[PDB]
Amino acid sequence: GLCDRFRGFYPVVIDVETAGFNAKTDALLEIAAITLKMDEQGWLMPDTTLHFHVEPFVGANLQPEALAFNGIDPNDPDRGAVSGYEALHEIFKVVRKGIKASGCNRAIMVAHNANFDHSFMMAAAERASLKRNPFHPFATFDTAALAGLALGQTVLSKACQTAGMDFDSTQAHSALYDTERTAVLFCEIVNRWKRLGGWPLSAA
Amino acid sequence: TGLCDRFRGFYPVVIDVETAGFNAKTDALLEIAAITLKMDEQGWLMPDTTLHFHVEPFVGANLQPEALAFNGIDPNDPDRGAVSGYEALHEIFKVVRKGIKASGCNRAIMVAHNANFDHSFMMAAAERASLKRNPFHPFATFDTAALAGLALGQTVLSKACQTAGMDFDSTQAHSALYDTERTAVLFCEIVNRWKRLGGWPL
Ligand SMILES: [Co+2]
Ligand SMILES: [Co+2]
Numbered sequence: 386g387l388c389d390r391f392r393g394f395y396p397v398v399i400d401v402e403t404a405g406f407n408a409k410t411d412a413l414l415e416i417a418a419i420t421l422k423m424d425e426q427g428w429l430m431p432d433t434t435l436h437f438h439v440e441p442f443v444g445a446n447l448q449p450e451a452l453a454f455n456g457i458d459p460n461d462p463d464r465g466a467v468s469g470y471e472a473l474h475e476i477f478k479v480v481r482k483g484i485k486a487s488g489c490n491r492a493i494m495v496a497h498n499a500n501f502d503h504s505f506m507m508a509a510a511e512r513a514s515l516k517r518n519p520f521h522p523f524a525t526f527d528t529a530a531l532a533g534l535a536l537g538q539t540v541l542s543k544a545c546q547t548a549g550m551d552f553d554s555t556q557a558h559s560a561l562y563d564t565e566r567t568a569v570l571f572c573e574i575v576n577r578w579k580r581l582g583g584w585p586l587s588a589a
Numbered sequence: 590t591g592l593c594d595r596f597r598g599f600y601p602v603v604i605d606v607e608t609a610g611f612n613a614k615t616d617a618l619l620e621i622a623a624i625t626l627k628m629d630e631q632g633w634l635m636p637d638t639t640l641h642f643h644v645e646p647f648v649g650a651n652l653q654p655e656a657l658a659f660n661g662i663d664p665n666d667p668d669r670g671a672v673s674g675y676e677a678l679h680e681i682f683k684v685v686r687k688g689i690k691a692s693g694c695n696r697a698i699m700v701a702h703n704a705n706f707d708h709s710f711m712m713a714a715a716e717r718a719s720l721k722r723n724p725f726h727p728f729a730t731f732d733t734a735a736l737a738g739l740a741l742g743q744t745v746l747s748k749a750c751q752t753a754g755m756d757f758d759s760t761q762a763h764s765a766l767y768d769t770e771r772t773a774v775l776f777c778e779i780v781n782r783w784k785r786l787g788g789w790p791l
Binding site for chain 1: 595596597599703704705706708728729730731732734735736738739740741742743744752779780782783786787788789791
């Protein structure tokens, strides 16, 4: 029922960490993705988590303030960084598999302040000349907006807390932790709508 | 009031734009409409004030025939009654600032369908017009395509409205005025429904 739930959209939770706000000039440094599934009773939950540290693309700009914010050291030899091509190709591939295996036709990014993460993902896919991009080129599910509606909060940490979730600022601004918190928040929001009887609308 | 408490000080304003292409930096803004919202005694959300403007293509703007065929707009119509981007935005920002003060919010947030698109065009037109004290938040938006996905399982405007039980007239679609009004009613219906089913207050 996953692909029935959003009319053929295959929701994938994404978070990105970067070296600035400029998607065309600034480095992509980190990306995590979480696919989702629906059980038999129609509840939504995380499926698979992918996480990559990303090497600054050749000639990339880097803003000191962004690095201070996310705490990432690009030259950290223990970072285990790969190219944007390698990271995005594997994320795209897992998503592409999920799509045709579930009956959806396109993936849609779920993210907190999604246009930020979406813009960076698209720019990096463009740089890497990745031909097959399973993600919708402009549509997103912004959890900041979704949390505004459901919890009256637009800030991730506060939203999770109000949602009755754990949240540790110590770990924030890290792709893996942020993506996982976002996935649980999204699932909680969707599941809660179902519990309240908001879903389904009618027979079907 | 209760409005400004509902979204932690954000003052939700519904926007829609018509353009001559998908590039917010280089393509002309052609139409813009704005609808502020209010909350009644029972705490239901509803439309307040409506503004609408036909916009003259800025000097040096590009024009995509496909976009113009779609929205039927002809930028060289003797009397589109068009005004400059500066004129439209100045008036909108003025009404919006008034709203913020009266209700006790501290910033405005754009409510639009596929909000990123409209938001980028609005910001570009503002820069272009060297306007300052833009009351709108520079990053945050309430995208009704995402909200309708959650609440209705539909991301397309016309489909989401119909699914919600509303009328959607294809004969009026793709006019800033008509689309903005449908977007506002859709957003109010979604917020109101969440409350109705006991999702709000917490
Ligand atoms: Co890259
Ligand atoms: Co203009």
